[PDB]
Design a protein that fits this description.
part of a larger assembly; 4 chains; A mainly alpha (44); B alpha/beta (368); C mainly alpha (96); B: 368 residues; alpha/beta; four-stranded mixed sheet; globular; C: 96 residues; mainly alpha; 4 helices; 42% helix; 0% strand; lissencephaly (chain D); Gamma_tubulin (chain D); Tubulin (chain D)
């Protein structure tokens, strides 16, 4: 248990950086990033 | 789901009675508990109509009012007397909880300043022990006074699962824009916030249809469970959203937010809401925690037809720690000025943990 | 005479001219002073994908205080060259 | 970028009041701070309407005015009172500061004629440079023991305020001549007019000069030579306006040459002739500029308030402003010989005499080095 919680973090955070990646390449669909992030987080 | 409200002490009964008076008018319910002729969900608070209230001298003022058809000063004395009537008052709640369809919570209206301070701390311990799956939201009100103020703070930091309203910010707003110079005049302002706090549980909305929806959104960690209120109109959504972030309206006497909830009770345009949030991000009127991703939430609502644009703000601000130091500092000054007296320092110990918990929450490495 | 009149009083030809000037020729302040001010804050692979330059405009129009009309749309902030790397050149178009 | 104003003393609160009346008249804003039915960006001065005013006796009559819904005699004593309420008053500034989106400057309306605000003005500028080092400050000071309080505040204004002088003497000359008054609320009618048109390019968007740094950065060449004068002719083509501005009968001031001029035209005049008027002013040689660097005159256009005729404002940095100081400091030496350490009055007299040297050196063809 103590060793699998950290696995989900590396697994779930990897998919989220994929969602924020594709949701950025667009011409709404651009204001979603301002709904996912507010603090400048996920800036990588 | 249902919610049973408990009113303790003189402060509880009055601000509770003014809470029911405002709500009974919002709905089409006459003071004699009969529906008037003249879509709003009223089953959560009213039982098919009768309010789900448990009142605990001031009672006679309520029984003589036209609303009769609707139903010491030491903290140790308040805690002791509750121990003696444990089975008596717990017999009216048990039937109130059982008789209910599917209980959800236990709203508590009290002030931490004499019997409601103690008897309030007593019920808060028994409630969690009797039911661990029932949320306990407490509308506490801040003012031997320093002692009783922090003693309940010890109970409110581990028992209560979730709103402070301090009389100092109530007095300042009263003299500023209301010109009162009176208890019966400040109560008109708090009850306006309470009836607006649960405006997303009396009308079927898209989101926040349960009491656990309003709580789990703001509170990130079970220790940081103190929230403050903001209410501007005493026009576009940008005007309201900007006036709420003014410290002249926040009812609280580095520092940053953890999560904000905005309640718009008007007929405003539903597409301009995203436009206002965009300009908020540019001008940078609010700063948040650096560690976790925090956002701001805004929800619309519909005013009762039987009973203009308003707005309320629910936020979890780290500046609330300042209020605790004021209570904490005054205690130590009294501890050097005067069976075992060991219950106090234990309370003094646990409240200091929360204060350090807050000051460590505003650091980029709050985790561990 | 009925053909020209049909343009002004129905399709607002007089508006389009006095609107494209507000955006292209940078006549309306608080817009160029907000668009150029944003782009110049950065300065390669960045600042070139449609996630920043296609969105900096939708952030610019909000700070215009003039626009946000059906005319205000259709401002494709596209590019026409891929820069590699002190000079005074930054090629970028703005088509109505 | 938002702008905020501060009014001190008896004078600043008076002209600032009429400044709020005339400005509130430009937009469709009722006296009760409510928009009526009846383009103009009203967000730089007003905050949703609420004006960003900070007022520091007459205040009682101000609230007694129909615009209530719109919100000693020594220098050291005026400086002492500012220290006794250091933190108490400053909270208003901070809460109005970050509550605003992006602060750009600080408009200061105050008098230096021996008032408690005159000292009160000296204190605020010291702290404004202490707390906010990235915030411009502009001050519309007004000129008249009076020599004392006047020369002292000049020591602070020459190193804190990064940028408009108005002497009551040259104003009253305009009063008797073209209004025939022979009062305080009479001359300020024109004073409020100067400030109102001074921000014509800010409240109405234009191409050039869309911010407070857009106007000041061109005129003031060095952080020392930072003094300006104003002109306002309408009291008709472009060649009529600029020619009536350069006359010493209109300037609001009591060799010598200009450094930079700014002329703001508010009318709907035909813009095809604005270059022609520039040619006739050059050829007749009606004004003289510096010899060392290429100094020119600039003009920009804007539109009047449609709710309320060709107006015009002239803003200039003239080295003749040095004479006004010489009138003041000369009185000081005379009062120095006629009457805990009295050392601050020394460095004050010292630093201004450096400024009077800095002006007289700018008029020489070898001002560099």
């Amino acid at each position: 248990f103590e060793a699998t919680i950290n696995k989900f973090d590396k697994n779930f955070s990897a998919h989220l950086l994929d969602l924020l990646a594709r949701l950025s390449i667009y011409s709404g669909m651009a204001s979603v990033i301002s709904r996912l992030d507010f603090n400048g987080f996920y800036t990588e | 789901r249902e919610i049973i409200t408990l009113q303790l002490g003189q402060c509880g009964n009055q601000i509770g009675f003014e809470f029911w008076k405002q709500l009974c008018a919002e709905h089409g319910i006459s003071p004699e508990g009969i529906v008037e002729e003249f879509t709003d969900r009223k089953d959560v608070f009213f039982y098919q109509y009768i309010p789900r209230a448990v009142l605990l001298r001031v009672i006679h003022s309520i029984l003589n009012s036209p609303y009769a058809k609707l139903y010491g000063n030491n903290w140790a004395s308040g805690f002791s007397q509750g121990e003696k009537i444990h089975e008596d008052i717990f017999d009216i709640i048990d039937r109130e909880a059982d008789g209910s369809d599917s209980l959800e919570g236990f709203v508590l209206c009290h002030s931490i300043a004499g019997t409601g301070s103690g008897l309030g701390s007593y019920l808060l311990e028994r409630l969690n022990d009797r039911y661990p799956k029932k949320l306990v939201q407490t509308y506490s009100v801040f003012p031997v006074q320093p002692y009783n103020s922090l003693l309940t703070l010890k109970r409110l930091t581990q028992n209560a699962d979730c709103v402070v309203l301090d009389n100092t910010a109530l007095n300042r707003i009263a003299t500023d824009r209301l010109h009162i110079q009176s208890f019966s005049q400040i109560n008109q302002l708090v009850s306006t916030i309470m009836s607006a706090s649960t405006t997303t549980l009396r009308y079927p909305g898209y989101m926040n249809n349960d009491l656990i929806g309003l709580i789990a959104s703001l509170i990130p960690t079970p220790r940081l469970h103190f929230l403050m209120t903001g209410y501007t109109p005493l026009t576009t959504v940008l005007d309201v959203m900007r006036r709420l972030l003014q410290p002249k309206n926040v009812m609280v006497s580095n520092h940053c937010y953890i999560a904000i909830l905005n309640i718009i009770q008007g007929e405003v345009d539903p597409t301009q809401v995203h436009k206002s949030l965009q300009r908020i991000r540019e001008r940078k009127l609010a700063n948040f925690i650096p560690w976790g991703p925090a956002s701001i939430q805004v929800a619309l609502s519909r005013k009762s037809p039987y009973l203009r644009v308003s707005g309320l703000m629910m936020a979890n601000h780290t500046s609330i720690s300042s209020l605790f130091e004021r209570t904490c500092r005054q205690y130590d000054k009294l501890r050097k000025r005067e069976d075992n007296f060991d219950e106090m320092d234990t309370s003094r110990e646990i409240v200091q943990q929360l204060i350090d918990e807050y000051h460590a929450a505003t650091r980029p490495d709050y985790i561990s | 005479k009925a053909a020209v009149d049909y343009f002004f009083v129905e399709l607002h030809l007089e508006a389009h001219y006095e609107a494209l000037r507000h955006f292209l020729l940078m006549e309306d302040g608080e817009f160029a002073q907000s668009l150029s001010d944003l782009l110049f804050e950065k300065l390669p692979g960045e600042l070139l994908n449609p996630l920043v330059l296609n969105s900096v405009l939708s952030k610019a129009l909000q700070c215009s205080l003039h626009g946000d009309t059906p005319h205000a749309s259709n401002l494709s902030l596209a590019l026409k060259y891929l820069p590699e790397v002190p000079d005074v050149l930054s090629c970028l178009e703005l088509r109505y």
